[PDB]
């Protein structure tokens, strides 16, 4: 509808493009990577999207135009070469196709055409639609939340605030995405869109939002965290957690409430300490009933159902708790008095009794933050600077009633909230703000949970996989959800496996007062308490990774990662292939289990464990097996106690002891859990953990770097822990030093330089001597990387490690060097030999099982080979592993389509020959 481009001048401070029809867009270039297209066929050009009401003065972006400065426009030149007029600078020509209007952008470096318009921008029936080209290998992520999935390509996802938190809906959404091609667009609209990536015409994207304006950031960056930076410094890096929001939090309404006595197998009876059954009642559902009315303090002959009850339920049962947030939900409260005073100093107790604990205070915070007259407050209405001035309040959960209208609502709400916070704090304390419902530029402010679903049922695992990976992939690295759901429950299997696998995840919620049992890690049996306990320790541990790579997040790679963050050149890695596994930061690929299905020895069975790069061992963390990469894994047994994860051989993940929340960490010791491998590195990160400090320089750096042999094989290990850098309050500069280097031999020698002098190392004869003394080296054939995961499971789950301590040190001033000779950390590797062994027979008879073919499967049958362990089948060009049995079957596969397999024989000694292929279609 705009027609030719007729002239592109280059005015005051961008390119004036005028349409044949009178239109005019700006082509604005912000950096030699990132420009701003606008048309505004109304014609205002004013720097910013019209909100949905104007009292929303929260922005997308973070970075003003002005602020990215006039040094890449003044470096762009325009051009008129005939049928095409063209802006270029150092890195891009953005090329106009004269008549068309068609806008391509060539990446100069690549000498590739990253992004092209097959037909110009349409503005039909109040929308404004954008058609791009999509090619065969282009895969595309973003949108936000989008529940149930992460990679895009032959689907269409809405940008909408669609206020659905099950698979299929939009817990948050954000209209932001990006192309493998290397290019991600940000669209400046508070309105609704929808994109379609070649659902039905594979060759086409387009790109649709509601309204008469097209505006949009095109980024343009070879790679991922290169592509995330950019929409970062855009719209705002991602806020840091303050430490305690790594650990799981407790969330319900304790100030509203009854419980009533009922007899044991009532219909949700809970048991609670007096050995009585009772169930909760609102006030208006209580009726004729005798009830106990809850408070939060207890303070009313009522304390077994109080807030401080639960608290002390954490306690004795041995359990990480870093927040509890006690007045969630409309009509809740958090006091009982006459007076909004009156409430907050009841909150105030519970906040003084929570921070004994070691436990900070959440609010359910409305839109309402102040009193209609703060200083003639009546009850029941909010005061934000009381709840946090007074009342010591840290953390902020949106009300769905605030932010559920979608779009500026949310944005203006969490930045409102994040300002007023920091205000009231005087930045002594950073915001912890858990929201949904989000848009561009959120994670600046506030992470997100994924709303209210129903746990105790497999499908609550199988979807919020790909949900915190599609989140992290749309810039949102603070995700989190319910600890098996705020509603159902009932099912100690899916309980125990949501613990596990969010155990590798940012943001973990008890969201109790609505399920089937009470939302708490000791809701099931001992076996259940047992396990749910050694994970939450085992997060508590791995504190100091954890946190490192939060920092990463804040202007980097998210701490959830879709596979092809990590692996970039596999194709399995960008697929569904790769929605039900990540890696949580560098060093860990988590696999979760995530259906019923079981051996008759109780063992889950999970296939489709794909471990990247044939050259990369893989190692078990929990038993030390070694796997090959450039497999994928079926029918991988795994117990109860177990949860497939699985380190990058060469990793450093640094640990500290088992504590139940930040201020029982040891801040004078430091341990490194290493896996040595080549020559690799870590950056520990540290700071006060809990105000704005670090955004004004105060935090601290630590590199770690490991030199020893290749996986498997003997030489000299070198690790080096270099002078900490930085500083901040209460920094502790005099820390002891563990290292725990996975070992299969003693080696020759260990010695230590601690600031270029000597320090001398005994061999220790006993463990007994080892965790008395320091400055001692003991080779230890029972190291336990989790001893509750030992006796939770009644498995030893024994490793070898050379284990080395040095005493108390300056980390500022003084370096650490130890050399160990002879170091060797070998053990047998699950495919590690994939040489053809000529002695090996070829699989015989490849054939499709015909009665076995549905619309969707196949299944592959052949001979056995006698001398065979396991086979392995190559699927259109993906190799699977672990094959126990002559047949194996492959699923996800579209209607009437066509696939290719070949097989080998795996034995002791190698492989055999790949097979012949075949070839097979579904009906």
Same mark, same amino acid.
């Given at each position: 509808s705009v027609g030719a481009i007729v002239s592109i001048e280059k005015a005051e401070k961008n390119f004036v493009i005028t349409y044949a029809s009178g239109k005019k867009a700006q082509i604005s270039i912000l950096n030699d990577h990132l420009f701003r297209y606008h048309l505004d066929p109304t014609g205002k050009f004013e720097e910013y999207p019209t909100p949905n009401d104007p009292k929303h003065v929260a922005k997308i972006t973070a970075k003003t135009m002005a602020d990215y400065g006039t040094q890449a426009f003044e470096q762009t030149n325009v051009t008129d070469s005939g049928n095409q007029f063209i802006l270029e600078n150092n890195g891009l020509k953005i090329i106009f196709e004269k008549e068309s209007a068609l806008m391509k952008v060539l990446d100069k470096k690549k000498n590739q055409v990253i992004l092209e318009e097959t037909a110009p921008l349409s503005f039909k029936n109040d929308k404004a639609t954008q058609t791009l080209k999509q090619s065969s290998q282009e895969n595309y992520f973003g949108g936000g939340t989008q529940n149930g999935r992460f990679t895009h390509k032959g689907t269409a996802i809405q940008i909408v605030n669609t206020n659905n938190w099950v698979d299929g809906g939009v817990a948050s959404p954000n209209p932001f995405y990006w192309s493998t091609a290397g290019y991600g667009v940000v669209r400046n609209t508070w309105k609704p869109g929808n994109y379609d990536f070649g659902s039905h015409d594979p060759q086409t994207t387009t790109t649709t939002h509601e309204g008469t304006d097209f505006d949009a950031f095109y980024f343009f960056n070879d790679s991922s965290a290169g592509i995330l930076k950019d929409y970062y410094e855009l719209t705002g890096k991602p806020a840091l957690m303050p430490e305690y929001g790594f650990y799981e939090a407790h969330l319900n309404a304790y100030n509203r409430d009854y419980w009533v006595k009922v007899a044991e197998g009532t219909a949700g009876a809970v048991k609670f300490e007096d050995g009585n059954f009772y169930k909760e009642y609102q006030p208006g559902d209580l009726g004729n009933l005798n009830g106990t009315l809850e408070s939060l303090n207890g303070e009313k002959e009522n304390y077994q159902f109080s807030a401080r009850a639960v608290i002390d339920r954490y306690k004795k049962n041995d359990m990480p708790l870093g927040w509890f947030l006690p007045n969630d939900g409309y009509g809740a409260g958090y006091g009982q008095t006459d007076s909004l005073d009156g409430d907050v100093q009841n909150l105030k107790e519970f906040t003084d009794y929570a921070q004994a604990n070691g436990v900070e205070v959440g609010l359910w915070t409305q839109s309402n933050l102040h009193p209609a007259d703060p200083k003639n407050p009546k009850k029941g209405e909010r005061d934000i600077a009381k709840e946090v001035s007074v009342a010591g309040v840290k953390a902020l959960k949106t009300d769905v009633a605030w932010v559920g209208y979608g779009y500026s609502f949310g944005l203006n709400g969490v930045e409102d909230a994040a300002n007023v916070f920091v205000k009231e704090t005087d930045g002594a304390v950073r915001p912890m703000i858990v929201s949904l419902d989000g848009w561009a530029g959120t994670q600046r402010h506030a992470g997100i949970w994924t709303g209210d679903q129903t746990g105790g049922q497999w499908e609550y695992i199988r979807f919020h996989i790909p949900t915190y990976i599609g989140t992290s992939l749309s810039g949102q690295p603070n995700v989190g959800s319910d600890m098996d759901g705020i509603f159902g429950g009932k099912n100690k299997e899916v309980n125990i496996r949501d613990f596990q696998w969010k155990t590798f995840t940012p943001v973990q919620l008890n969201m109790d007062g609505w399920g089937s049992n009470p939302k708490t890690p000791f809701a099931f049996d001992q076996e259940a308490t047992d396990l749910n306990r050694a994970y939450l320790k085992l997060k508590s541990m791995m504190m100091p990774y954890n946190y490192s790579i939060a920092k990463e997040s804040v202007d980097g790679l998210p701490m959830v990662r879709a596979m092809a963050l990590e692996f970039p050149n596999e194709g399995t890695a960008y697929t569904k292939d790769s929605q039900y596994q990540y890696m949580w930061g560098p060093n860990l690929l988590v696999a979760p289990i995530y259906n019923g299905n079981q051996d008759e020895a109780g063992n889950s069975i999970r296939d489709g464990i794909y471990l990247p790069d044939e050259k990369q061992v893989w190692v078990d963390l929990f038993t030390g097996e070694k796997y090959q990469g450039g497999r994928v894994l079926n029918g991988v047994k795994t117990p109860l106690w177990k949860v497939p994860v699985f380190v990058k051989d060469g990793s450093i993940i640094p640990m500290t002891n088992p504590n139940n929340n930040p201020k029982e960490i040891q801040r004078d010791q430091r341990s490194f859990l290493i896996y040595p491998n080549g020559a690799t590195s870590f950056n520990m990160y540290e700071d006060d953990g809990i105000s704005t400090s670090y955004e004004a320089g105060q935090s601290a750096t630590t590199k770690i770097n490991s030199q020893g042999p290749k996986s498997n094989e003997k030489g000299d290990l070198t690790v080096t822990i270099e002078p900490t850098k930085g500083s901040y309050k209460d920094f502790v500069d005099?820390?002891?030093?563990?290292?725990?280097?996975?070992?299969? +031999?003693?080696?020759?020698?260990?010695?230590?330089?601690? *600031?270029? %002098?000597?320090? &001398?190392?005994? !061999? $220790?004869? /006993?463990? +007994?001597?080892?965790?008395?003394?320091? #400055?001692?080296?003991?080779?230890?054939?029972?190291?336990?990387? /989790?001893?509750?995961?030992?006796?939770?499971?009644?498995?030893?789950? /024994?490793?070898?490690?050379?284990?080395?301590?040095?005493?108390?040190?300056?980390? &500022?001033?003084?370096?650490?060097?130890?050399?160990?000779?002879?170091?060797? #950390?070998? *053990?047998?590797?699950?495919?590690?030999?994939?040489?053809?062994?000529?002695?090996?027979?070829?699989?015989? /008879?490849?054939?499709?099982?015909?009665?076995? &073919?549905?619309?969707?499967?196949?299944?592959?049958? =052949?001979?056995?080979? &006698?001398? $065979?362990?396991?086979? +392995?089948? +190559?699927?259109? *060009? %993906?190799? @699977?592993?672990?094959?126990?049995?002559?047949?194996?079957?492959?699923?996800? @596969?579209?209607?009437?389509?066509?696939?290719?397999?070949?097989?080998?024989?795996?034995?002791?000694?190698?492989?055999?020959? =790949?097979?012949?292929?075949?070839?097979?279609?579904? !009906?």
């Amino acid at each position: 509808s705009v027609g030719a481009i007729v002239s592109i001048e280059k005015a005051e401070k961008n390119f004036v493009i005028t349409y044949a029809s009178g239109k005019k867009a700006q082509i604005s270039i912000l950096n030699d990577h990132l420009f701003r297209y606008h048309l505004d066929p109304t014609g205002k050009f004013e720097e910013y999207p019209t909100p949905n009401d104007p009292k929303h003065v929260a922005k997308i972006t973070a970075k003003t135009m002005a602020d990215y400065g006039t040094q890449a426009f003044e470096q762009t030149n325009v051009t008129d070469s005939g049928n095409q007029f063209i802006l270029e600078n150092n890195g891009l020509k953005i090329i106009f196709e004269k008549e068309s209007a068609l806008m391509k952008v060539l990446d100069k470096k690549k000498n590739q055409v990253i992004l092209e318009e097959t037909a110009p921008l349409s503005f039909k029936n109040d929308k404004a639609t954008q058609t791009l080209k999509q090619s065969s290998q282009e895969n595309y992520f973003g949108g936000g939340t989008q529940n149930g999935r992460f990679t895009h390509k032959g689907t269409a996802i809405q940008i909408v605030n669609t206020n659905n938190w099950v698979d299929g809906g939009v817990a948050s959404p954000n209209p932001f995405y990006w192309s493998t091609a290397g290019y991600g667009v940000v669209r400046n609209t508070w309105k609704p869109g929808n994109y379609d990536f070649g659902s039905h015409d594979p060759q086409t994207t387009t790109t649709t939002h509601e309204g008469t304006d097209f505006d949009a950031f095109y980024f343009f960056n070879d790679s991922s965290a290169g592509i995330l930076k950019d929409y970062y410094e855009l719209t705002g890096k991602p806020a840091l957690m303050p430490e305690y929001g790594f650990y799981e939090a407790h969330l319900n309404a304790y100030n509203r409430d009854y419980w009533v006595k009922v007899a044991e197998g009532t219909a949700g009876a809970v048991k609670f300490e007096d050995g009585n059954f009772y169930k909760e009642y609102q006030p208006g559902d209580l009726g004729n009933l005798n009830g106990t009315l809850e408070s939060l303090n207890g303070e009313k002959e009522n304390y077994q159902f109080s807030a401080r009850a639960v608290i002390d339920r954490y306690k004795k049962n041995d359990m990480p708790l870093g927040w509890f947030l006690p007045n969630d939900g409309y009509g809740a409260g958090y006091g009982q008095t006459d007076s909004l005073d009156g409430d907050v100093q009841n909150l105030k107790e519970f906040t003084d009794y929570a921070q004994a604990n070691g436990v900070e205070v959440g609010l359910w915070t409305q839109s309402n933050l102040h009193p209609a007259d703060p200083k003639n407050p009546k009850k029941g209405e909010r005061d934000i600077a009381k709840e946090v001035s007074v009342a010591g309040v840290k953390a902020l959960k949106t009300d769905v009633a605030w932010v559920g209208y979608g779009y500026s609502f949310g944005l203006n709400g969490v930045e409102d909230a994040a300002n007023v916070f920091v205000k009231e704090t005087d930045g002594a304390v950073r915001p912890m703000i858990v929201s949904l419902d989000g848009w561009a530029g959120t994670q600046r402010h506030a992470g997100i949970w994924t709303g209210d679903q129903t746990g105790g049922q497999w499908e609550y695992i199988r979807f919020h996989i790909p949900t915190y990976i599609g989140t992290s992939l749309s810039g949102q690295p603070n995700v989190g959800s319910d600890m098996d759901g705020i509603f159902g429950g009932k099912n100690k299997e899916v309980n125990i496996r949501d613990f596990q696998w969010k155990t590798f995840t940012p943001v973990q919620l008890n969201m109790d007062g609505w399920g089937s049992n009470p939302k708490t890690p000791f809701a099931f049996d001992q076996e259940a308490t047992d396990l749910n306990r050694a994970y939450l320790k085992l997060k508590s541990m791995m504190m100091p990774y954890n946190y490192s790579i939060a920092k990463e997040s804040v202007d980097g790679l998210p701490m959830v990662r879709a596979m092809a963050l990590e692996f970039p050149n596999e194709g399995t890695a960008y697929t569904k292939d790769s929605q039900y596994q990540y890696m949580w930061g560098p060093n860990l690929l988590v696999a979760p289990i995530y259906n019923g299905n079981q051996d008759e020895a109780g063992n889950s069975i999970r296939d489709g464990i794909y471990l990247p790069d044939e050259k990369q061992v893989w190692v078990d963390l929990f038993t030390g097996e070694k796997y090959q990469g450039g497999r994928v894994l079926n029918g991988v047994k795994t117990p109860l106690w177990k949860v497939p994860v699985f380190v990058k051989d060469g990793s450093i993940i640094p640990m500290t002891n088992p504590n139940n929340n930040p201020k029982e960490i040891q801040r004078d010791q430091r341990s490194f859990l290493i896996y040595p491998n080549g020559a690799t590195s870590f950056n520990m990160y540290e700071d006060d953990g809990i105000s704005t400090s670090y955004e004004a320089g105060q935090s601290a750096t630590t590199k770690i770097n490991s030199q020893g042999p290749k996986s498997n094989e003997k030489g000299d290990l070198t690790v080096t822990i270099e002078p900490t850098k930085g500083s901040y309050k209460d920094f502790v500069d005099e820390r002891s030093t563990t290292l725990d280097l996975l070992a299969s +031999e003693a080696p020759e020698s260990v010695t230590a330089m601690v *600031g270029g %002098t000597e320090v &001398t190392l005994k !061999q $220790a004869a /006993n463990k +007994e001597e080892f965790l008395a003394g320091t #400055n001692l080296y003991y080779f230890d054939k029972e190291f336990q990387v /989790n001893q509750y995961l030992s006796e939770a499971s009644g498995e030893k789950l /024994n490793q070898s490690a050379l284990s080395v301590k040095l005493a108390k040190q300056s980390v &500022t001033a003084k370096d650490v060097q130890i050399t160990v000779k002879g170091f060797i #950390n070998k *053990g047998t590797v699950d495919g590690g030999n994939t040489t053809v062994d000529d002695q090996l027979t070829i699989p015989a /008879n490849i054939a499709i099982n015909e009665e076995k &073919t549905t619309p969707s499967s196949l299944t592959l049958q =052949w001979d056995q080979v &006698t001398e $065979a362990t396991s086979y +392995e089948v +190559e699927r259109d *060009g %993906t190799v @699977f592993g672990n094959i126990q049995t002559n047949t194996a079957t492959f699923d996800g @596969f579209s209607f009437l389509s066509e696939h290719t397999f070949r097989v080998r024989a795996v034995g002791k000694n190698g492989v055999s020959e =790949w097979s012949e292929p075949i070839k097979g279609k579904t !009906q």
